[PDB]
Enzyme design. Structure first.
Site, mmCIF file in Angstrom:
data_model
loop_
_atom_site.group_PDB
_atom_site.id
_atom_site.type_symbol
_atom_site.label_atom_id
_atom_site.label_comp_id
_atom_site.label_asym_id
_atom_site.label_seq_id
_atom_site.Cartn_x
_atom_site.Cartn_y
_atom_site.Cartn_z
ATOM 1 N N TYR A 12 45.415 33.680 28.865
ATOM 2 C CA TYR A 12 45.004 35.068 28.730
ATOM 3 C C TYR A 12 45.511 35.891 29.904
ATOM 4 O O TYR A 12 45.802 35.372 30.983
ATOM 5 C CB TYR A 12 43.479 35.198 28.633
ATOM 6 C CG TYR A 12 42.740 34.843 29.901
ATOM 7 C CD1 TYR A 12 42.399 33.529 30.184
ATOM 8 C CD2 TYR A 12 42.374 35.825 30.810
ATOM 9 C CE1 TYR A 12 41.719 33.202 31.340
ATOM 10 C CE2 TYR A 12 41.695 35.508 31.969
ATOM 11 C CZ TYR A 12 41.370 34.196 32.229
ATOM 12 O OH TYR A 12 40.694 33.874 33.381
ATOM 13 N N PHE B 261 43.706 42.652 35.976
ATOM 14 C CA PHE B 261 42.676 42.131 36.865
ATOM 15 C C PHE B 261 42.558 40.614 36.825
ATOM 16 O O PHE B 261 41.992 40.031 37.756
ATOM 17 C CB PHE B 261 41.315 42.751 36.523
ATOM 18 C CG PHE B 261 40.815 42.410 35.150
ATOM 19 C CD1 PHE B 261 40.120 41.235 34.922
ATOM 20 C CD2 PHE B 261 41.036 43.267 34.087
ATOM 21 C CE1 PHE B 261 39.658 40.922 33.661
ATOM 22 C CE2 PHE B 261 40.577 42.957 32.825
ATOM 23 C CZ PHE B 261 39.888 41.784 32.613
ATOM 24 N N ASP B 262 43.071 39.962 35.784
ATOM 25 C CA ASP B 262 42.995 38.511 35.687
ATOM 26 C C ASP B 262 44.106 38.008 34.780
ATOM 27 O O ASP B 262 44.580 38.722 33.893
ATOM 28 C CB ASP B 262 41.632 38.054 35.159
ATOM 29 C CG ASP B 262 41.395 36.570 35.363
ATOM 30 O OD1 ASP B 262 42.136 35.951 36.154
ATOM 31 O OD2 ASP B 262 40.467 36.024 34.732
ATOM 32 N N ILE C 173 32.191 36.060 27.283
ATOM 33 C CA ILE C 173 31.512 37.190 26.665
ATOM 34 C C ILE C 173 31.735 37.178 25.151
ATOM 35 O O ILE C 173 32.668 36.546 24.628
ATOM 36 C CB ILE C 173 31.951 38.532 27.278
ATOM 37 C CG1 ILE C 173 33.478 38.637 27.367
ATOM 38 C CG2 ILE C 173 31.307 38.709 28.656
ATOM 39 C CD1 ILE C 173 33.982 39.928 27.992
ATOM 40 N N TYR D 18 31.264 43.134 29.981
ATOM 41 C CA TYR D 18 30.209 43.073 30.986
ATOM 42 C C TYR D 18 29.260 44.262 30.886
ATOM 43 O O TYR D 18 28.076 44.130 31.214
ATOM 44 C CB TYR D 18 30.831 43.002 32.379
ATOM 45 C CG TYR D 18 31.670 41.763 32.587
ATOM 46 C CD1 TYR D 18 31.081 40.537 32.859
ATOM 47 C CD2 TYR D 18 33.052 41.819 32.490
ATOM 48 C CE1 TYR D 18 31.847 39.404 33.041
ATOM 49 C CE2 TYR D 18 33.825 40.693 32.671
ATOM 50 C CZ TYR D 18 33.218 39.488 32.945
ATOM 51 O OH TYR D 18 33.988 38.363 33.125
ATOM 52 N N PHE E 18 42.999 42.314 26.419
ATOM 53 C CA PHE E 18 43.407 40.961 26.771
ATOM 54 C C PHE E 18 44.572 40.546 25.886
ATOM 55 O O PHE E 18 44.623 40.925 24.714
ATOM 56 C CB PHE E 18 42.244 39.977 26.593
ATOM 57 C CG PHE E 18 41.226 40.034 27.694
ATOM 58 C CD1 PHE E 18 41.451 39.401 28.904
ATOM 59 C CD2 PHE E 18 40.043 40.728 27.518
ATOM 60 C CE1 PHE E 18 40.514 39.459 29.913
ATOM 61 C CE2 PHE E 18 39.103 40.788 28.525
ATOM 62 C CZ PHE E 18 39.340 40.153 29.723
#
Lengths: 47, 49, 97, 94, 676, 107, 97, 132, 93
Positions: F26, F36-37, F56, F82, F99
């Site tokens: 991902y 961010f990731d 999530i 979140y 994503f």
């Protein structure tokens, strides 16, 4: 009465016996040993 | 509010490394870390990118 | 990792990235291990019995005059292991506060 | 009554059930009271007992067995340890 | 510098394997660390900071060699102590196989084994300079093992006596000296690291000697619990470098709870003193206490947990208690402000550090005593800012803290049922020098008196808007009336404990006579009799079966009278039949009658009933038992004697009564009936 | 919530079932296009088991819809993400997430 | 001089403590030995200050409180010599005094 | 280490005695030729009148380098003190003297009573009246 | 001492009076201690109430074929029968 009561060393767990031996060896053998490194160290550092 | 004002200093005056130094000093002093200051600085400065 | 292996980075940035890696990943474990290294708790395991001052040799009577290579060999003093958590930002946060 | 050795066992029976009655119903016993039973009724032996090792083992038994579960077997075996401790001064046990 | 910093961090973490360590050593110095570019990092002519990193690497390797020495010594101890224990078994076997042929020799041999195990090991080991069999039983075969190991250890450390180093110690010494010779080092940290390394290399036995105090050996079974305890201790140590917050407070509480639950904390207190856990916890406590001194003690729960942990650490063993006695003064310094948390305090830690230890009580310092006396004077002078801010009426003094300081002084003076003369005298002089400690009631210029003060406090309790703010997280905070009563009870208790001993008084020591006279001057007898005579509120059944229980936290209680009884017994003493009968008629017998009347199922287990039971059994009944001989020839107060006998018997026939309390009651009854 | 857009096709026959572990790669972007990731930087595929509430609900539904050997863009609403609390220092409050997820295999 | 005066007061108090007892115990003798050693060192220091001679130091000591300390030592010396001479076991302490 | 460097070792021959004096002087030269006297004075001034192992070691080093009334060391110390004109040195010396202790009868009585009291427990297990 | 102490001397005297058979003083070979135990427990073993206890002792007599058995195991094995017959007679809580 504790004096009359025996306190065998061999009725003592090995780990406690080891700790006591370490303390006694440090106190009587390692500490009593004398080594005069001061003169040699000062001469080496001065040269 | 103080931390956000210090960050708005970066926002409005420009990319000054002295403001970054001040923010760095806010985190730690004499080897002791202030977790509240660290967390507030992180939250208010980093996620915006 | 790319910054670590880079050669053309300015000195300040290279040092900053090395120190950033250390601070992010290794600093806490290093601090804990350094704090714990001052004490020696020796379990009475067979490995402990196997330990000797000088490596098995014949060079000299008071053990071989040569020592073993420092830091190499069996050490049984208790040191707690290191604990790390994977960096993942898609996991669910705890429901509680 | 009856055979003397038998009578000795029923004396054991009654002495143990004296404390069983107070703490438990008839048979159940707790070390909480077994300690007092041994240290009181076997007071005569320990006066002449010189096996410091065995009496020390008993003093270790008391603080080991504070959990407070005991029965006739435990009491008889530990008081047998006490009596052999006292008498083994009198007579060689190897 | 960056690469060396990373390598040093990884080494200290211990991640590097044996092959990696060998490669690093080859890089550092190819020739010296050679199993079985030629220039090394040490010989590569690097800048000063790089030299600092290299010094860190060399420090790590020297620390590893020290660890190796310690572990080798531990293993040799494992073997040698087993040998000694086996031979000791054999020797006892032979000595018992000896049929007391010659007592002069049997006792001489058996004193060895009657001696404590530490002295046994010392005597056995004492053959370094040479000893015969009689003095040292150890055979030459066992002795030679130790001699060989000692020679090996000296050879390893180099004290047993080239152009190339050929060893780590030689390499480090040569490198440090060569660097210093080549350049005038301008880096203070570099110079310090260089000379620390050089000193470690030169003093091999010194380093091992200093390290051994931190060496401990544990059985294989204890490894898991010891590792868990090490994890908790590492957590606590890590919290030393962060300002305390909520997360850190919770973590600290959890760590302390787990440490107390763990068995190693009980089975190996010496390991804990070596680890220094007590000092770490104390440093965390004092840091947080100092934080925000003027405002308040932030995170009271953490401080309470730390104080409980330290007190229980003292309770575990005497040596731990002495360790905390060493730091007593620090705790007394930090105990300036308290009772805002209402839980355990550094003052409680200090009290536990000296409780029930004659040696430590005698070693207690006059400076430490005067610090607490000064705190008590400050409490007697000024009021409590926390209570004033809460809104409590301004009384002008702090009974709440005065009671805590008096409790500490009582624990200091009184040990194991007997007064410590030195501490008692010092405290008496210090208290008389500062009369404000006695409080406003005994304050000389216009003191109303102790009886008047206690009556006034009872009226305070009865009157709302003066006992409390009257504008309750812990049973309604505090009550000023009960606080005043508690302060005066604690003061009188401390003075009674300071009272000299009966055998000293009989010997006629002028110092003891003077101290007792001073105490009598401070406290009149009639005041004590009146206070003992004051009426206690009793539970009653009213309002459709509702139990009207007096509120203990806010009312006069039997303990306040028990302190007065202790003072009357130790300082004044009962020596006259008329006085005994008078006090019995006025103060004691009504309380005994009330305790008997509260024996019913409804009030049997009430808090006031239990308080009266404790008060009687611990203060009064023992006093009457001691005074029993005076009851001979009391035919004139026959009615009162009969009533007292009946009341005592009725108390004896009581439920909800502990076995010790019943024993005290029964002993009092037999003592009375022996002389009546 | 969650919207799924197919970047590359998959087999179309195998879809994750409850209690079955999924291995994925991902790359997380904020709705503004800020990364961010990403697991690909760590070089280690992310493994998660369905129905255990580890990730999530946006993942729990999007990956469930996806098939083995499929690459897809998942747009996850703020509340499925979140949400108001966010992930401090990484994701701002009330942030939609985008994503790029590849479902390597199921185990 | 002030430290010497404190020392002489302490020694006089200790002698008054041990005056009643017929024989001084081992711990008392040890404490006396330490006190007299320290006093000897202080006297040697004062002598070193004043010898040469140093007129300023001589006048300073003359105006100082050295005289009271010397009086205390005179009293203690007389009484202690009598008491210690009455007993043979304390000969070493008498020599030190 | 520096203090022990200066050894200070039947009447010996007069040559023996002077020759020993010469080693003592050479060993003290090795130190005070390198600033040891100034270091000692600076450390005594820095201690600021609080007793401890630091000031004890400093005083021992000073005694070692001054043994025999070394005039060169005395002049080196005097010149440094007069040149720097600092009051901290003598203030610290005065504070240390004020902190020096004397015989204490209360302490003597406490120690006597503590020694009189004895452990019931085994000496190895408990302290058994071993205190400074 | 208490009457329990007298019971202890009873046990020790019986053990010694039968140890004089084979064992030196506080030792006794099983080949004889077996005869002691059946002969002296004849009342108990004859009024045996726990078939389990009686069969355990009847197998113990053969299990301990070593010619050496200590006083602790003797008291334990006699108590094995005694406590079984005891628990049968009385309620056992």
């Amino acid at each position: 009465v504790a004096c009359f009561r025996m306190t065998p060393l061999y009725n003592l767990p090995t780990h406690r016996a080891c700790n006591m031996f370490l303390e006694s060896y440090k106190a009587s053998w390692i500490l009593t040993e004398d080594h005069s490194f001061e003169d040699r160290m000062i001469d080496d550092l001065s040269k | 509010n103080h931390i956000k004002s210090i960050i708005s200093l970066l926002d409005k005056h420009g990319r000054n490394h002295k403001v970054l130094d001040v923010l760095c000093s806010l985190c730690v002093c004499n080897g002791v870390a202030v977790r509240s200051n660290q967390d507030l600085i992180t939250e208010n400065l980093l996620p915006g990118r | 990792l790319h910054a670590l292996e880079d050669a053309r980075l300015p000195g300040p940035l290279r040092a900053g990235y090395y120190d950033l890696l250390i601070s992010i990943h290794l600093e806490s474990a290093c601090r804990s291990r350094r704090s714990m290294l001052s004490e020696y708790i020796v379990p009475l395991t067979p490995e402990t019995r196997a330990i000797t001052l000088f490596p098995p040799g014949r060079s000299a009577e008071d053990g071989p005059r040569r020592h073993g290579l420092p830091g190499v060999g069996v050490t049984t003093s208790l040191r707690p292991p290191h604990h790390f958590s994977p960096p993942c930002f898609v996991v669910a946060l705890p429901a509680a506060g | 009554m009856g055979s003397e050795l038998e009578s000795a066992m029923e004396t054991l029976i009654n002495v143990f059930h004296a404390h069983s009655g107070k703490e438990g119903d008839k048979y159940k016993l707790s070390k909480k009271e077994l300690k007092d039973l041994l240290q009181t009724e076997l007071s005569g032996f320990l006066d002449v007992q010189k096996d410091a090792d065995a009496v020390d083992k008993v003093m270790k038994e008391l603080d080991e067995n504070g959990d407070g579960e005991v029965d006739f077997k435990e009491y008889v075996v530990l008081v047998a340890a006490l009596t052999v401790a006292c008498n083994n001064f009198f007579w060689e046990t190897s | 510098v960056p690469v060396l910093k990373l390598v040093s961090t990884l080494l200290v973490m211990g991640v590097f394997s044996d092959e990696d360590v060998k490669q690093i050593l080859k890089m550092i110095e190819p020739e010296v660390f050679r199993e079985e570019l030629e220039e090394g990092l040490l010989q590569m002519k690097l800048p000063e900071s790089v030299k600092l990193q290299m010094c860190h690497l060399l420090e790590y390797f020297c620390d590893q060699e020290l660890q190796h020495r310690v572990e080798s010594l531990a293993a040799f101890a494992e073997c040698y102590v087993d040998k000694m224990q086996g031979n000791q078994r054999g020797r006892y076997g032979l000595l018992m196989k000896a049929f007391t042929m010659s007592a002069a020799e049997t006792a001489r041999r058996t004193r060895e084994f009657r001696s404590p195990p530490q002295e046994q090991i010392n005597m056995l080991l004492h053959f370094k300079n040479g000893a015969d069999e009689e003095e040292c039983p150890l055979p030459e075969e066992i002795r030679q093992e130790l001699v060989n190991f000692h020679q090996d250890l000296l050879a390893h450390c180099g004290i047993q006596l080239e152009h190339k180093p050929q060893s780590l110690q030689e390499l480090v010494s040569h490198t440090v000296v060569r660097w210093a010779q080549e350049d005038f080092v301008q880096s203070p940290e570099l110079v310090r690291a260089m000379f620390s390394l050089l000193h470690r290399q030169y003093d091999g036995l010194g380093e091992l000697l200093r390290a051994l105090p931190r060496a401990y050996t544990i059985s294989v079974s204890s490894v898991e619990d010891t590792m868990s305890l090490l994890e908790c201790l590492g957590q606590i140590r890590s919290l030393l470098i962060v300002q305390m917050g909520p997360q850190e407070e919770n973590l600290m509480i959890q760590s302390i709870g787990n440490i107390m639950n763990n068995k190693v904390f009980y089975q190996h207190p010496n390991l804990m003193r070596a680890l220094g856990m007590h000092e770490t916890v104390m440093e965390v406590m004092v840091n947080v206490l100092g934080g925000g001194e003027s405002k308040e003690i932030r995170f009271p729960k953490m401080v309470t947990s730390c104080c409980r942990f330290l007190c229980y650490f003292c309770r575990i063993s005497r040596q731990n208690q002495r360790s905390m006695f060493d730091h007593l003064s620090y705790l007394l310094e930090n105990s300036g402000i308290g009772l805002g948390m209402q839980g355990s305090t550094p003052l409680d830690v200090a009290a536990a550090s000296v409780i029930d230890n004659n040696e430590l009580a005698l070693a207690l310092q006059e400076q430490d005593l005067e610090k607490v006396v000064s705190y008590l004077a400050g409490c007697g002078l000024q009021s409590c800012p926390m209570l004033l801010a809460k809104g409590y009426p301004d009384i002008g003094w702090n009974p709440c803290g005065g009671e805590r300081y008096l409790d500490f002084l009582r624990f200091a003076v009184f040990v194991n049922g007997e007064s410590v003369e030195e501490n008692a005298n010092v405290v008496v002089r210090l208290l008389i020098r500062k009369p404000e400690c006695f409080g406003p009631a005994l304050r000389g210029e216009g003191g109303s008196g102790l009886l008047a003060a206690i009556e006034e406090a009872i009226r305070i309790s009865e009157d709302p808007a003066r006992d409390g703010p009257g504008v309750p997280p812990e049973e309604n905070r505090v009550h000023l009336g009960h606080a005043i009563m508690s302060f005066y009870a604690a003061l009188i208790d401390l003075l009674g404990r300071c009272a000299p001993e009966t055998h000293l008084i009989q010997a006629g020591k002028g110092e003891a006579l003077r101290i007792r006279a001073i105490l009598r001057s401070l406290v009149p007898l009639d005041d004590l009799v009146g206070i003992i005579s004051l009426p206690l509120q009793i539970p009653t059944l009213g309002k459709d079966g509702a139990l009207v229980q007096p509120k203990m936290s806010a009312s006069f209680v039997p303990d306040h009278k028990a302190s007065m009884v202790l003072f009357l017994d130790r300082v004044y003493g009962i020596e006259n039949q008329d006085f005994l009968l008078h006090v019995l008629d006025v103060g004691f017998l009504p309380d005994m009658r009330a305790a008997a009347s509260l024996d019913t199922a409804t009030f049997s287990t009430t808090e006031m009933a239990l308080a009266l039971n404790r008060y009687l059994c611990l203060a009064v009944l023992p006093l009457i038992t001691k005074c029993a001989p005076l009851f001979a020839g009391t035919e004139h107060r026959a009615i009162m004697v009969d009533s007292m006998l009946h009341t005592v018997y009725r108390l004896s026939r009581g439920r909800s009564l502990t076995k010790a309390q019943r024993d005290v009651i029964e002993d009092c009854l037999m003592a009375l009936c022996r002389y009546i | 919530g969650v919207q799924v857009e197919t970047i590359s096709p998959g087999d179309g026959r195998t879809f994750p079932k409850r209690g079955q572990t999924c291995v994925v790669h991902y790359t997380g972007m904020l709705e503004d296009g800020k990364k961010f990731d990403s697991s690909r930087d760590r070089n280690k595929p992310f493994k998660f088991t369905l129905g255990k509430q580890e990730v999530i609900r946006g993942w729990e539904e999007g990956v469930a819809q996806m098939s083995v050997g499929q690459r897809a863009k998942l747009i996850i609403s703020s509340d499925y993400a979140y949400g108001a609390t966010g992930h401090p220092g990484i994701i701002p409050p009330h942030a939609t997430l985008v994503f790029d997820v590849e479902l390597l295999k199921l185990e | 001089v002030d430290y010497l005066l404190r020392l002489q007061e302490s020694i006089s108090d200790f002698y008054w403590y041990y005056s009643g007892k017929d024989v001084i115990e081992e711990q008392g003798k040890r404490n006396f030995s330490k006190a007299m050693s320290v006093a000897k060192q202080v006297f040697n220091s004062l002598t070193e200050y004043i010898q040469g001679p140093c007129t300023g130091n001589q006048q300073s000591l003359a105006h100082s409180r050295l005289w009271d300390a010397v009086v205390g030592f005179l009293h203690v010396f007389a009484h202690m010599m009598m008491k210690l001479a009455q007993d043979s076991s304390q000969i070493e302490l008498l020599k030190e005094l | 280490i520096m203090a022990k460097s200066c050894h200070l070792e039947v009447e010996v021959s007069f040559e023996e005695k002077e020759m020993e004096k010469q080693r003592l002087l050479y060993q003290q030269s090795r130190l005070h030729n390198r600033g040891a006297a100034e270091m000692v004075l600076q450390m005594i001034s820095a201690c600021k009148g609080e007793t401890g192992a630091m000031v004890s070691s400093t005083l021992k080093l000073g005694i070692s380098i001054l043994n025999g009334g070394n005039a060169e060391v005395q002049q080196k110390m005097l010149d440094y003190l007069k040149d720097k004109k600092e009051v901290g040195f003598f203030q610290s010396i005065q504070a240390l003297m004020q902190t020096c202790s004397v015989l204490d009868l209360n302490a003597f009585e406490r120690q006597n009573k503590a020694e009189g009291l004895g452990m019931v427990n085994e000496d190895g297990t408990v302290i058994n009246r071993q205190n400074g």
